[PDB]
Design a protein around this ligand. Structure first.
Ligand SMILES: *SCCNC(=O)CCNC(=O)[C@H](O)C(C)(C)COP(=O)(O)OP(=O)(O)OC[C@H]1O[C@@H](n2cnc3c(N)ncnc32)[C@H](O)[C@@H]1OP(=O)(O)O
Ligand SMILES: CC(C)(COP(=O)(O)OP(=O)(O)OC[C@H]1O[C@@H](n2cnc3c(N)ncnc32)[C@H](O)[C@@H]1OP(=O)(O)O)[C@@H](O)C(=O)NCCC(=O)NCCS
Ligand SMILES: [Cl-]
Ligand SMILES: [Cl-]
Ligand SMILES: [Cl-]
Ligand SMILES: [Cl-]
Lengths: 504, 513
């Protein structure tokens, strides 16, 4: 059938190439796109080709690119290859863009995801010249139906001088109805409105993004797919991690520190997460509820098994198999999923009110339980902080999960001092590795260290950590959080120098 | 007249020493007390004495002490002197207690102030045996009127097995009515209640703390003053910082990024604050509003002048001459002030909704604008994170202010890498020192560094900082946040070893050329 149901807006249809010409060197461009879902695809490719051409002619041609979160090859990839992004925010997972960032070729700032809309309204990224947004359809009354994520799209539409819409036939038409877009003041000028959400399942808005049709300068009909998560399954390391956490939850319920149905669940991006969700799929906790940033394979499975009743998120992140599963049964799943603006899904006010349990991955933690989520050796960007801070600090319980080692045992995920900190001690109560679980609630830093070292550290590294800690306790400037500054970062330098943190 | 207006409770009145006997070795004790205001005084003194006696006889006697925030000499001081505290949370400014913490004699964890109540209810500190709370009065129906702070007192009252009240006749009776205590679910079991505050001057509750009178085991009549620590008159460094900040505010207003009345202001604990507040009282900005953790001298002044229309906080933080002024006019100041539970004053939902401007001190920041508020050389506690995280992360604008050097120039407040992090780059947008102001909005880390180094760092240190940065850019494992791990913490180690961050010219340093 026809995706552009507003007749007058059909007159605005044009080629991706023509549309890209609307984007000028220096422009700030806000796009849809979150966890590889729902980003614009055709216009960016054409922009990319035109950028390389201009460069070869000695013509400066770059943009600032603000998204919901991560995109995909068509967007971050192509623009990165063309060397056409001078600034990027707030979250990337594309390899080429990552290389531009780590080479100092593209400036990057990974804002808390729930804050981006507000900072954009404040003007932190500059004036938005363009909003480039992917849509499933356009309603008769000119509503824009989003695709597989909401992200920041409503805000970008509000802000931008000109609007380009990509309407993508690839996206399932039955997405229409799944989203909840609130017309309230969440990220606008203070004083903001109270967001009246008191239950994860509660809808407070409507199914479409709103925009003034006068701002729409081009509509481009497209047909191309989102990225998929890898299908692969959780290994023995992940399963052990899931096992410790599930036992922990069990003991909390017995002590009456959690209800039998737990609390609204936030599961982060990563593979350790899927182990946990798979664990919960066949777990003893019924009538679960998700209040997260993303719907991954694991959550989809739990909605399937009925072990989870409903899930709130801003986006999808699904394997091709999971994607197929949902696109066949969209009517079933649609009644169990709510996609929200990311400034609502990641609202600290709402997260705390609902009492979410936050479960996130990490690069590394130090012995005191400070967490690095982002910067390897302190300087090389992986993905970004994303929403891990939004959730960790606001949660009822903040949990970080990781293999105790990386790179085949050549790196310890528990270190004397983190090379970069994303989450301070105060924002992390529980740590889990395949070695065990450390419950840090109510503990001082020295007490946190004893737990983390004995429970979580790999046997190969535990004695080295105990050696560091003992000598710090003896020789540190202060004894509240004992360190030896001459060796605090020495394991990282050793990896840099030798390829392993294990001494020779 | 009587401060205890409920007849039935009068029979529970007893001497401080006797009340203190209710507190046993190993007890978890929650007390009133926030920034030198409203903490209990006589019972802790008596308790300290008995602890010392037990110790002298080889008998153990220590408590876990959980407060609103910092207390004063009568409580933190006396107990630390007696070595009577095995665990302390969440915030302390007493020098003796600080020494116990830094020697490893008292275990310490500085929780975000707005989260303490919820973590207590969750059971993180264990079961509360005693709540010890200072009061102005007890009402006819048994309500407890708090004194110069609210803090966590309501939560401690709810949780504790037994309750002790100190009724302090030094505290002005006209404090009654200044407090706003909510029966709503702010820090209890989820799902919590919506906290419906949509203006800084809005009251949502009532004037008294509520407690089952059956739990009140003792009441002590007292008469002793709060720790009205001395007014630190702003020096030229502080004034310069304030000048740059006020110029910034003026600019934001001129560019229509702030209303002429600014937005609700949070001013952190510290000495740079007085400069800022003094600057604001002379400034061009009218109809100001405070939504803060504390009310300090500078705020009282603007309330008196009408420059500030209302001030919301959990506590007072006044100089003796400031307690003096307000005492003579509590009648007047009571209509300009609202004292709230700290889980409400420091609620991230509310702070964001109101759009607070956060202004906080710091120990140090690295060139990328990560902030240390707590741990000198990374291991020695100063005060604690307090509510700086509550406010920094939730604010409309997050501003950190500090002298560019410390220890008479022997330490640079801008460093290659912070020795400890309290506020990540994402939580800090504006930096101000006496050297200038760095506006970091929309910048990548490398861009942040160029601004911080050029605007904020002291001239004595900027060449060294630029040298680090330049060489990191060339050599760092990654170029997103360039570091040289061999040197990152070397200025701190130089200070530990030699008492200065400055290099000795007797040896090479790449910036010396
Ligand atoms: S929406 C709310 C939550 N959002 C976030 O948490 C955003 C930030 N978090 C993330 O980016 C991921 O959670 C990270 C922290 C990268 C971990 O992801 P995983 O859970 O999938 O863990 P993996 O073991 O699979 O690691 C993935 C890649 O990261 C590398 N890595 C992990 N740990 C280290 C250490 N200590 N040192 C170096 N590298 C490390 C892994 O090597 C892996 O990368 P590869 O390129 O595949 O080797
Ligand atoms: C960080 C903090 C101590 C700074 O206080 P300040 O009055 O603004 O700054 P000052 O320059 O006067 O220095 C205060 C102390 O810190 C020390 N200090 C400051 N910077 C230092 C540095 N870079 N290295 C070593 N010591 C430093 C000073 O020497 C002084 O210590 P002293 O009493 O032993 O002489 C203070 O703001 C604080 O404790 N913050 C945490 C709580 C908070 O921010 N709450 C917010 C809501 S109220
Ligand atoms: Cl809200
Ligand atoms: Cl805790
Ligand atoms: Cl709320
Ligand atoms: Cl920003």
């Amino acid at each position: 059938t026809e995706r552009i149901r507003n007749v007058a807006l059909r007159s605005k249809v044009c080629p991706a190439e023509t549309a890209s010409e609307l984007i000028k060197h220096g422009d700030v461009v806000g796009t849809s796109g979150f966890t590889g879902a729902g980003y614009p695809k055709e216009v960016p490719k054409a922009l990319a080709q035109r950028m390389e051409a201009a460069h070869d002619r000695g013509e400066k041609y770059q943009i600032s690119l603000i998204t919901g979160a991560s995109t995909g090859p068509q967007l971050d990839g192509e623009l990165a290859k063309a060397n056409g992004v001078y600034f990027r925010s707030p979250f990337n997972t594309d390899a080429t863009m990552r290389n531009r960032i780590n080479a100092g070729e593209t400036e990057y700032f990974d804002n808390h995801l729930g804050q981006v809309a507000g900072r954009a309204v404040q003007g932190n990224y500059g004036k938005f010249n363009i909003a480039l947004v992917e849509a499933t359809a356009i309603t008769e009354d000119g509503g824009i139906v989003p695709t597989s994520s909401v992200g920041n799209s409503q805000t970008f539409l509000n802000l931008a001088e000109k609007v380009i819409i990509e309407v993508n036939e690839w996206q399932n038409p039955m997405l229409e109805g799944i989203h909840d877009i609130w017309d309230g003041n969440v990220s606008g000028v203070p004083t903001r409105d109270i967001v009246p959400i008191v239950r994860a399942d509660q809808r407070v808005g409507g199914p479409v993004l709103r925009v003034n049709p006068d701002k729409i300068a081009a509509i481009v009909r497209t047909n191309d797919r989102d990225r998929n998560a890898p299908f692969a399954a959780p290994d023995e390391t992940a399963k052990a991690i899931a096992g410790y956490l599930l036992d922990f939850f069990g003991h909390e319920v017995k002590q009456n520190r959690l209800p039998p149905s737990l609390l609204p669940l936030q599961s982060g991006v990563g593979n350790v997460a899927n182990a946990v969700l798979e664990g919960l799929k066949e777990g003893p906790f019924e009538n679960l509820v998700g209040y997260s940033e993303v719907i991954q394979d694991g959550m989809l499975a739990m909605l399937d098994s009925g072990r989870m009743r409903i899930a709130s998120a801003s986006s999808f992140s699904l394997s091709p198999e999971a994607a197929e599963e949902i696109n066949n049964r969209m009517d079933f799943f649609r009644s169990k999923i709510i996609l929200r603006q990311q400034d609502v899904s990641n609202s600290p006010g709402i997260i705390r009110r609902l009492g979410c349990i936050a479960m996130n991955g990490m690069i590394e933690a130090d012995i005191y339980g400070n967490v690095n989520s982002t910067r390897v050796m302190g300087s090389k960007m992986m993905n970004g902080i994303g929403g891990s801070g939004d959730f960790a600090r606001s949660s009822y319980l903040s949990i970080f999960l990781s293999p105790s080692t990386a790179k085949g045992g050549k790196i310890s995920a528990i270190v004397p001092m983190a090379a970069h900190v994303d989450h301070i001690m105060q924002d992390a109560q529980i740590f889990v590795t395949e070695q065990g679980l450390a419950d840090l609630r109510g503990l001082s830093p020295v007490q946190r260290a004893r737990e983390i070292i004995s429970k979580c550290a790999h046997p190969d590294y535990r004695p080295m950590l105990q050696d560091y800690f003992d000598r710090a306790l003896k020789n540190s400037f202060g004894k509240h959080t004992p360190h030896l500054l001459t060796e605090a970062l020495s394991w990282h330098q050793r990896f840099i120098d030798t390829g392993t943190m294990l001494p020779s």
